[model samples]
Target: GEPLYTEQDLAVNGREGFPNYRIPALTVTPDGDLLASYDGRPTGIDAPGPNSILQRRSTDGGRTWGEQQVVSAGQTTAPIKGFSDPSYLVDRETGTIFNFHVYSQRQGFAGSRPGTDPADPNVLHANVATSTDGGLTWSHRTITADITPDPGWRSRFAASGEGIQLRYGPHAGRLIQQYTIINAAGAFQAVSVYSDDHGRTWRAGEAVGVGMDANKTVELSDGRVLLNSRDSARSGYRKVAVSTDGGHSYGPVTIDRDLPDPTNNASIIRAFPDAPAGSARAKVLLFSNAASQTSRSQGTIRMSCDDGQTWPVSKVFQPGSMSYSTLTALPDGTYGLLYEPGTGIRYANFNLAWLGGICAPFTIPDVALEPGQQVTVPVAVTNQSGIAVPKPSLQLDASPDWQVQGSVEPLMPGRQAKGQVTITVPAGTTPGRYRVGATLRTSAGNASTTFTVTVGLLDQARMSIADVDSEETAREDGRASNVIDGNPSTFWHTEWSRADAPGYPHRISLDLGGTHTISGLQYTRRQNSANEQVADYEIYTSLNGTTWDGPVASGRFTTSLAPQRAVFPARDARYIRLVALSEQTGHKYAAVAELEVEGQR
Candidate 1:
């Protein structure tokens, strides 16, 4: 078995009396020294409090590190003041290192007032510390006035991570630092602050993307600077923008779906520093971040061979409780990473071989079809492990209700094997959507993918309800059985008395007389002006009434006496639940005149 990586904790809690460490900023200097920086908080308090900019240098490519040093010192005054969010950039020409951070005063991000004065203890200030001799010593300078676009801006701080120095473009000597500025209206935008004359002066570029935060920049082969940012809204993906004119302005921002971010800081860098544009090595870009949507877990590394176009290879570097991360290409053809995993910052050194795994180059596109329709899906699996993969097989891991057939063969290093997977929707299958997952198994490991199978909806006979979760028997004809009686005049309502009413996310589970394939449901709004209609709702389907499948469909219902339809992909189930997330008129009650299930039995 091959080793994944070699890692060691660089900074731990209470290491030097600091209770916490966070926000990794790592970069390799022109002299081949690995300089890593982070925020050392006295306690759990975030920025604008007592925090220091800490750094540790590695002269041997992260294999060994020096004692902790401070780039900016913190104060113990009545109101703690400190520097945080350290981001690094090295001048390849001068061998000087620039560390950018924010000097907070009385307030944190949202509390900082609008100003660019570092002397003022009332606003957030931008500062950069420079090291001329391989990070042995440092000199600090505040660039808040030089780069601040508007004095009325709420706060502007450097995004923590590694910045880029242009190599192949017209602005080859340019140095860029990514920043996020909050405007007067409390809106956030990412801006590129660049220095062309060896860090003497800096200028702010035009802002791009709303709600953008902690970003990193990389100069592409063809002179364009690609900016990847963390979304403040936690959109579950990283945002991207490009600058053609030396980081002066940017084009429209777009979401990078391949990079899933949990609103945490990420890092991206060129796999080869000296590779010229248009060369094969120039296309190799590396990205690192916590790759889960729901939590700060699954710290992963992704590699893109076509610049920032597609990420065909990925592997989890850290699997648990990971957050901010930074990546750097070392001089010895290896990679160095500094990442925070909840407790402390750890450093990992790994080579490209350690990133080897099965790379599935195929995607199972969402499929839609009519009942009994058949479709053949083509898929391919590539072997990136630099070794032969024997007995490679493709298997469709799907529900018993589906009819699937998959095929595969052996694969050679860097070569791929092609196969076909057939999917058939039965004549009586549910009319809603179903999730189908497939895996490519090899002797070494496996790679998996998923696609949605959708079938058309067709109205069936009035469905007979055999069971229910609950019903308001206190109201006239309000029993759960009345909803399926095929009578619009008679309705089922929830308990409405304020003292005894259940909470909003009310559920109404019903068991169909037998298993049925359903694609849509009809909610017959109460005929009378009861104003107890459902506002927001979700639909869940199950087989045994105990194990559920989905909120397969969810949305708001139209407030009208006319029947409204909730359409979804086909689903086979004996139980269906209607969940009322909220009620119309902002009241705490839900009423239904009739319920109708559409599909085939």
Candidate 2:
């Protein structure tokens, strides 16, 4: 009836006994408990230090969650590290629980932090931790074998979502995980890592050296592996690479231009590959992501009939600032999705019948706003009805100032209409939490959803480097501030690793976090793309006037995409600036994946 986990539940309460949480990988276990793994990033995504790969359990479904236990954590001993992007895989063939997460020394988000070479030993390690029973014990780690398909390539992992334990074809029992590889030169590729002997050992398979990251896959009716990947920071389309030999090789890394992207992580799953043809779940593959070519607000779910082919159907699961999302199927056949932008975790549950309009029905972020300062909130559809949903209407009501600026056209089969359901807090609304209630009346049924608005004493949003201002044509482009959310596959990039026309000394600044004495700053290099990385950069402190001081901290970053940190003496400043000086690629404009300032108030 409600979301399984919320940013409120996972990050707020003692769900993790921590300040923050990000990157979720949820799947079902043989014993019924929903197995959810994620990173409890204490210092946020960019900082270096103690990070955890934690797991949570839900016995009665997503209704409630048990305390999260650290499945495998970093910073246990010396040469400390942290883990991000935890993925789940089950050997239904055995009821065994296998969790795969990306681990790296607390250098930066991607493992190799500032000054560390990605190609160096232990820069980035993709390891698996296994267990069974009810959390009594976990097996030893099985380090991923170096399958640098190219001597120039390095790194791999589970693409941050649930990978598969194949139950079809000769590869049954094979646990396959998607991965991305990067070279010192910033070349990116996609590959698969499989363990044929249960959870014993791991090996690397076919590699498609292209712009691919944290990927997802579906088994086709033809017994082939259809590898789909996040195509952010490059061709605005998702890359679909097909593999015939289980986890063997991927070819022609083709782009499905029909799929628009915001350079974020997405999930793809097969409803039931074993379901007989023409059955209720026949040859169906479901893909969930933001359908916007620009904004990360259009949350959508697409369905494919011909395996990994063309998607002829789709529906907006309700759109408004969504980033990481994954699809999981329950024993009763219902599908679940857990996404973000709303505190801990935001989820929406849907069934196939309504998903395809066979029957139809349904419904399901936070932004810190200053007093009387309003940010537009989209009209959200709480319920999704079948193809014949008649007289569907929307109502947005609250105590303060609010208006349904405009409503979408209508919901037609395979078509979804949307528009802004603008809301604004009154000029004198006290700085506190408020709620907006919504009612979607439909002949089929109705849905109730609540929108949260938290007004602060100021007239602006939270001051952080994670805010966006605008955009323009670039040499190479992606969801520019994806990294600001801690990260997703790539970073805010220029056309190339080495800047050309709009060449070097590319700079990024933030007006958030008004003037104050600050100590230092932390930032992540553009990961994945080696040569496209920022080699030299300077950090400058600024007052509210943009009148800045000296380059507070400056240095050359490593050739890897790991987060880089620089500390300087205290200074009186309200704003911060990051300037990209040179590129490792020695050819293009500077690429800054993530930029962050550090200070304690």
Candidate 3:
């Protein structure tokens, strides 16, 4: 079921009105009234050409709205290029309303260049304004003078900038506004300022380089602040970073690599307040954007529980170019979002209660199975909550090329819902490890767990070791004194002539006095690749040192690159001989770190 506010539409002045164009900025007051600010310019980008900063309010949540009113407008003679970006905030204690907008004086249109500034006449400046009487009236201030004079600074033509109420630190009661500024070099930067004595006097702060536009900040319980920023490089993603000592210095921006960028300005919010007593840090972050890198306008909402480490839950809110969004935690503990729903502004409300009960306790029946075998895996899905659950749907999937045996049954919402699935191993399946997982999707949310199963051939034979090799003349106990050597010139070789030995193949051999059954062999590949070509070798097992058998396994592997381990089994042999067939591209000889053998008991 949806939350209480989800069913409501835009509530402006207790009555709803149809104000087209995109309304990206929203603010809520303490007495439960909602304040929404958007641009009323008919031209999408060239807003406020005489573009007006329009606002509406709702006394009863967002169920209804009031008539639209112009909060900021261009100068009387010279029309405002168009009012674009706007942000709003409310003082919880004083009931004061603070709304902000970026005033651009460029002439042609939103993105169009007049070739010169019409208002300022000599310089280009970004201005700001505020409202105290619930959007009834406003005061304007020109905060920045010629924002583009700095070597590398750019301003969002119209649709940019945001404001939030500070909850902690010395700046608590003040309104903090974040403005997006770009440099001549095309790097995105953000600057934040706050007003302490209401909106009278504003103090400027240092600028932090956020690689994108539409930056929002939230205060954590421990006084730490987090900033969620959009990706400006058009890489189609967003990022999060933290500030420990107030909002001055920010840590290295940690990029969420898996997040797909929508190529448009996005919005993010912190789910709940940090614990009051300074307990465990539990924060939920919500990001809404087009979940694709190639497309600019489709919207999906993803949630993060562990700060911002990983995101495991996501759902489609609206499918289209739903760009800017705002999220608010309602008085009823439910969540509400106001977003530009393509046609007009729309709202969605939901809560954690919809997820039903807690997750179930299930185990993977077969931990390990041989290839080509039919394995029956039983999953016990039980309701952990006190109340009984309704039946939910189940989905099971295996890694690529693997097959599932039986059909997945619908799970009853109750104590224990048991079901069985059969797995059919595919022929010619690579001898390696694979993972299989199952998920239960219900009204509440989706819960899933994964288990790994190893697939390999059956053991056929074994080897009996009569005596081990003991040859450590250079060191104590006959063990090789130097395991790793930097020089490849003095390594092992197949030929006995030391001088003629390519100065690379430094040899080490194991002497098996008698023959026995050998099933598997293990050896550590060296990590001495100076060039692209690292090491290529062949393993040959022989009964006597005089003659050798067919090559058991031969391949070229690189060490300087990514780390990898190779395992081969079911080969029948008495003695194992490993030879370095090729060395790294420029190095003389390949190297081996360790070796081991496994056989039947």
Candidate 4:
């Protein structure tokens, strides 16, 4: 079922007098207004040419927006510089909004050099724009001198999206922004740039992790700052670190295996910013990004009820292509997301009820399954809504033929219920991923979840069609079907019952029952006779029975009655074919007592 949300492209390419828009930074001002900032490109790319930092205002929580406002303007040619990568920080106590961006001269992040000179063409400069009247007015200044810069720093830019203003601990009300710094060694690191006196002055923190980049920070319920970032090496997951002293320094970086990533920037924030640090409401953390390991797709919003320790609730708002995004907890309990989905930076408005009032940790096995295979998936749902759920139940929405079972007890406010779902795959389902969607319904509201079942190989019980170029069907023992019957006494022989029997170049193909990540096969020769045993051979594979992708493996077997193995690089296939080039006696014939394909199910 489709979820509830509203979207509008706030800034579009080739419109709003700009050729491109990217690097979205969004936040809600203390006055309950939405302020969104992004990069306005002149040549439809990043710096070198003039790039401008642009902002838009929405008095109604993003339902409508004011005209675009230029925070810092870029020049038309090189040497004059432009601004890029806008990230916002709002002082809740002061109601002041700050926009941070980088002033690029002749180079971008990859091409910048190590230097502190503001006039240097290779060095990057930092700038900030401030607005005290909820984005209606503005003042701008360069922060390159204010922020502690090093001559060894090749490039440093604020991690785009939004910064955090601490609400608890010794550094309460301190403004902190996440930044990506490339040092003289050309290694990227994640650092926090902070200002104790609002936006008057700023300083940099010690770097953490060698390849950390493009991160976002959020204060946990215990007053610790949790930094979640993208790995420049594309580690297939997000990186995280903790800061005890607000954001001045950090601990060792650890990979968060829970959040799958494609080396892209993501956003994180507390679901209820003003809910008192350690309260049950403050424990809800929201994260947004392209939830994938290989592509910038499946734009998802995951909800964590335990301060990011586990993300149990997930809903995909954008299942297609998506990139960098910013998440902000709106003043009215709804959420606002500013993201790039190809054409421009779009804004989406949603609420927890729309995301489903249930936060549950559900898992699907990451292995191959066979038709008719039964599996039990454990699920636990928690009531995250404000109201009590009198009659909470879990329902599975999958193929009508799949036998699914399970239900949960009623869920009270902030309470949890555990249950198990048993699913039996229907026969004849294609070999691939099968979607098994789940939904949790409550008397108050409902939420949805996602999981999948994979269908693939099954050992010797694999259902397959045994075919051959020619078989000695005169006797049932010598038929091609005998090779896969799991009996060593029965053998398959090339048409040898008559004088015009089939000779060399005999082939035997088997439909492996389902698609498998096959490594290779085992062949057992007949024990009673040495006649017509395959010698020189080649093995091939195919997804369908017709198209082939081999000789995946090729070799010759010695004159032995024992079973021999043919190993090859693992590949995905549903059909396997073995071609016998010559016989053990150097005669034109082939025979096999049994054949076994080995791989994962």
Instruction: Please report the candidate that would top TM-score against the real structure.
Output: 1
RMSD of every prediction: 10.9, 15.4, 13.6, 14.5
lDDT of 1 by residue, 357-438 (tens): 3544446677667778889877766544456766777778766877899887667776767778898887877455566777
lDDT of residue 583 for candidate 4: 86
Candidate 4 global lDDT: 0.80
Give the residue spans of candidate 4 off by over 4 A. Answer: 1-4, 145-151, 360-391, 395-404, 422-601
Count clashing pairs, candidate 1: 8
Global lDDT of each candidate: 0.79, 0.63, 0.54, 0.80
Can you write out model 3's per-residue Cα lDDT over 1-601, one digit (the tens) per residue? Answer: 5422254444222223323556567766666667677765544454334456777777876667787777775443553344556777666656676666656554322242222243553223445665566556777766553333353343443234245555666656665566566555555676556666666666544567646566777665556667767766443456667777556556777545547665565666655643442333334556566677657555776665445444555666666666667766556566667677665556667665442323343444545565677787776654432344465665677867777743334544444667667787776565444667666656555655456655652221222222222222321112222222211111221222233434343344444334544544444443232431336666666666547675666776655332233344455555666555566665553444344444322
lDDT of 4 by residue, 436-518 (tens): 77777665545666676656434655746557988877633478877877555567878876888778889999888888888
Which predicted model would earn the best lDDT? 4
TM-score of 4: 0.69
Weakest lDDT window of 10 consecutive positions for candidate 4:
359-368
> Worst ten-residue run, lDDT, model 2?
356-365
What does candidate 2's lDDT look like per residue over 270-352, in tens digits?
87745753443545778888787556667787776556454545678756877788888777667768776546565456776
Q: What is candidate 3's TM-score against the reference? A: 0.59
Candidate 4: Cα lDDT at 358: 55
Q: Residue 396 lDDT in model 3?
A: 74
